[PDB]
Amino acid sequence: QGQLVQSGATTTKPGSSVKISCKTSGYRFNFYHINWIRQTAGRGPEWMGWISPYSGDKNLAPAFQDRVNMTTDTEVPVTSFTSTGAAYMEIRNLTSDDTGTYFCAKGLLRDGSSTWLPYLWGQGTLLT
Amino acid sequence: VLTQSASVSGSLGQSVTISCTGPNSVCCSHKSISWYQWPPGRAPTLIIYEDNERAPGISPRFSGYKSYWSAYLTISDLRPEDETTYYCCSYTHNSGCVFGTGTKV
Amino acid sequence: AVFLGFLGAAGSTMGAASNQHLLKLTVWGIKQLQARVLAVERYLEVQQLLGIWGCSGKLICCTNVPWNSSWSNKSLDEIWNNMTWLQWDKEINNYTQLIYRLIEESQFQQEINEVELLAL
Amino acid sequence: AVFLGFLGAAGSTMGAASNQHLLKLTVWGIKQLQARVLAVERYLEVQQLLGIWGCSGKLICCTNVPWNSSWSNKSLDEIWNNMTWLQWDKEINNYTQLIYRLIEESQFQQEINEVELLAL
Amino acid sequence: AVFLGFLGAAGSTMGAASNQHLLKLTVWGIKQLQARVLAVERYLEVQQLLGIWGCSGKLICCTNVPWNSSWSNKSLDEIWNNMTWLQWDKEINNYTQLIYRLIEESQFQQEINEVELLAL
Ligand SMILES: *[C@@H]1O[C@H](CO)[C@@H](O[C@@H]2O[C@H](CO)[C@@H](O[C@@H]3O[C@H](CO[C@H]4O[C@H](CO)[C@@H](O)[C@H](O[C@H]5O[C@H](CO)[C@@H](O)[C@H](O)[C@@H]5O)[C@@H]4O)[C@@H](O)[C@H](O[C@H]4O[C@H](CO)[C@@H](O)[C@H](O)[C@@H]4O)[C@@H]3O)[C@H](O)[C@H]2NC(C)=O)[C@H](O)[C@H]1NC(C)=O
């Protein structure tokens, strides 16, 4: 189960630095990576990066190496295996090329070869 | 940098095969290949991870394969709802998905 | 007394966790006496299952009872690389009594096949 | 507590049978306490013979002591297809202490032959 | 209760030695009760080390931990044909806790190599 509701579809103008939220429910927020992948209108789907809500470790794409700031606040425990965390992501020198729908997805597993694979996607926030 | 099939399609009862190949920096005999059923703009779906492993809940019709230079995605026994787009990932254990050009059906 | 180090990896995945004398009947003496009896009772309670399943002296013993998929439909990547031993128990706690009886008889039928094998 | 199902075939042939907390020293509490101690004592009493004979975790263990015909002169059809485990004990109850000492040393001499074998 | 015959060769070399019911809380009853509990406690205290080292039901079990010469520098003729088990303990009593942890993990790593071996 689980649902990763995203922020609002707010659109600004070039030069801005919009922040996109992604709060989770129904699963252990610290047990899986969070992942952000956009779908540019004039490009193929582009993977941006994942961060570990537990270790606090980040790994992003070269096209977003010094352009994206993504963070996560700690989880609010609900039961032994349910938490309510949140994931935020910003962009630096945003232009009209970054126009498109943005997604947040959680990791596939918590060990092995495909640990961080974006398995459970959110809802999507439409940008400029 | 990761090319796929231009386009393919079939009828209810047959099967397809969406290719996914590329240069030595993205494919294949040293990276894992995953497959997503991704309708454009909407919430996608993980259908295959690391070459041929099926995600939980996936019907046993989505069979995967990977030779030393290309990975295939067979969608045997087609359904009306299978007609969307498909992209393939290129990833290891400590990296990121390198998506492909996509292939509609 | 023994160790709670097993418990170190209670939140880790199943693949990571697995990888003086004189008696005086004072209020503390009776308290400390039952703790001594309650230890050897709970210890042998587990240790007799390991013996009757043909697994005494073993930490990980493979059996011969096939995995009936009705007990769990999850993948080997969904179990050993996702679930923790604490939550995996809650999912399978219905069939634990049904599984403990199969391992009990798989050992019993293995014993009679050995008494026929070593007779040659 | 364990099982009296073993006892189901007490009249069957030998071949068929083989094939809350808090302590209170009330009159019932002292009664129920010794029952708990008398169980683990009688249990390990048998379980240490199985261990010292090299048969821990086993239900049927074959040994290396030959059957001295002076213990019983009956045939294998007269034993496993006729006598019951209850009456077979009465016939052999004289040599049970004489047999338990041979199985005890057959295991002991097997241990020193293994420490010489695995040294190669 | 068991035997003090092991103790027969307490001065021999290491190579020679190795080769009714009802409870009543009277002063004697409480005395005889703890003796019964103190026996099963000290018995399982040793018997759980043998089990966790993969040596249950064994008198002499060979391990896989090499002999670190810093524990003792003596020769095999200086040990098994000279020292007695009573005095050999005093020489090595410092590393006994350091050795008991290696035999404990040599068994643990042997168990995971078997679960990978029997999977073929
Ligand atoms: C508590 O619960 C959490 C979450 O459930 C557990 O954290 C997860 O552990 C698993 C398994 O250990 C992790 O999966 C691994 O992911 C790594 C990816 O990290 C690598 O890449 C980073 C970016 O490139 C890099 O910085 C890392 O390098 C070091 O730096 C960080 C800094 O914090 C440090 O924390 C790291 O530990 C590194 O020392 C790192 O190299 C990946 O490498 C792993 O793949 C290998 O291992 C698997 C076997 O496990 C094998 O199959 C692969 O083929 C490959 O050999 C593996 O995928 C996961 O990322 C963790 N985080 C999550 C899921 O969010 C935590 O372990 C639990 N702790 C306890 C005590 O229970």
Side-chain angles (χ1 to χ4, degrees), chain A residues 30-33 50 52 54-55 57 59 110-113 115, chain B residues 93-94, chain C residues 11-12:
Chain A
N30 293 344
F31 282 4
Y32 302 101
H33 297 266
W50 46 259
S52 189
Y54 168 82
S55 174
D57 197 65
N59 184 89
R110 40 202 303 246
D111 206 344
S113 305
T115 303
Chain B
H93 54 280
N94 49 10
Chain C
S12 303

Side-chain angles (χ1 to χ4, degrees), chain C residues 1-3 6 18-25 33 36-37 40 43-44 56-62, chain E residues 25 30-31 33-34 37-38 40-41 44 47-48 51-52 54-56 101 107-108 111-112 114-115 118:
Chain C
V2 197
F3 233 120
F6 301 180
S18 173
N19 288 12
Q20 296 177 357
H21 59 285
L22 283 194
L23 217 176
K24 244 288 187 177
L25 285 316
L33 175 62
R36 296 200 299 161
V37 181
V40 319
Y43 175 84
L44 300 185
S56 64
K58 302 220 61 182
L59 291 175
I60 305 170
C61 66
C62 300
Chain E
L25 285 316
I30 313 159
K31 218 90 175 306
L33 175 62
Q34 187 180 5
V37 181
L38 208 29
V40 319
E41 281 194 311
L44 300 185
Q47 204 59 223
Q48 74 171 344
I52 202 177
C55 297
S56 64
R101 191 161 294 174
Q107 175 67 23
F108 180 75
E111 294 277 68
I112 65 176
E114 184 187 45
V115 82
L118 271 65

Side-chain angles (χ1 to χ4, degrees), chain B residues 34-54:
Chain B
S34 99
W35 289 94
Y36 284 98
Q37 174 226 109
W38 194 340
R42 302 184 67 261
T45 294
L46 180 59
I47 233 70
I48 283 295
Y49 65 101
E50 41 192 322
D51 300 15
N52 50 35
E53 309 298 313
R54 299 192 293 102

Side-chain angles (χ1 to χ4, degrees), chain E residues 19-80:
Chain E
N19 288 12
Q20 296 177 357
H21 59 285
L22 283 194
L23 217 176
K24 244 288 187 177
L25 285 316
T26 168
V27 290
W28 291 133
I30 313 159
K31 218 90 175 306
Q32 191 256 347
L33 175 62
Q34 187 180 5
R36 296 200 299 161
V37 181
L38 208 29
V40 319
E41 281 194 311
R42 224 283 157 173
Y43 175 84
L44 300 185
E45 200 188 75
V46 172
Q47 204 59 223
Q48 74 171 344
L49 292 187
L50 253 48
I52 202 177
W53 301 343
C55 297
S56 64
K58 302 220 61 182
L59 291 175
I60 305 170
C61 66
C62 300
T63 64
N64 228 275
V65 277
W67 184 258
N68 187 17
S69 185
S70 54
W71 302 333
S72 182
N73 197 26
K74 307 312 129 189
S75 170
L76 217 118
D77 236 6
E78 305 178 32
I79 295 178
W80 300 100

Side-chain angles (χ1 to χ4, degrees), chain D residues 36-101:
Chain D
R36 296 200 299 161
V37 181
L38 208 29
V40 319
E41 281 194 311
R42 224 283 157 173
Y43 175 84
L44 300 185
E45 200 188 75
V46 172
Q47 204 59 223
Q48 74 171 344
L49 292 187
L50 253 48
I52 202 177
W53 301 343
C55 297
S56 64
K58 302 220 61 182
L59 291 175
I60 305 170
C61 66
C62 300
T63 64
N64 228 275
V65 277
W67 184 258
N68 187 17
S69 185
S70 54
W71 302 333
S72 182
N73 197 26
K74 307 312 129 189
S75 170
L76 217 118
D77 236 6
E78 305 178 32
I79 295 178
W80 300 100
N81 280 235
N82 210 47
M83 304 198 192
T84 72
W85 271 105
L86 236 185
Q87 54 188 161
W88 165 263
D89 194 79
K90 182 171 64 179
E91 177 179 346
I92 203 188
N93 95 282
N94 293 119
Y95 323 99
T96 15
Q97 301 288 357
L98 197 147
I99 295 177
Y100 289 175
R101 191 161 294 174

Side-chain angles (χ1 to χ4, degrees), chain B residues 10-13 37-40 42-43 45 47 57 59 61-62 75-86 104-105:
Chain B
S11 294
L12 288 78
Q37 174 226 109
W38 194 340
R42 302 184 67 261
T45 294
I47 233 70
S59 187
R61 90 190 73 151
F62 300 89
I75 316 179
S76 55
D77 195 359
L78 287 123
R79 290 264 205 271
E81 66 275 7
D82 296 12
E83 190 245 3
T84 46
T85 336
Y86 293 102
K104 311 176 63 62
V105 298

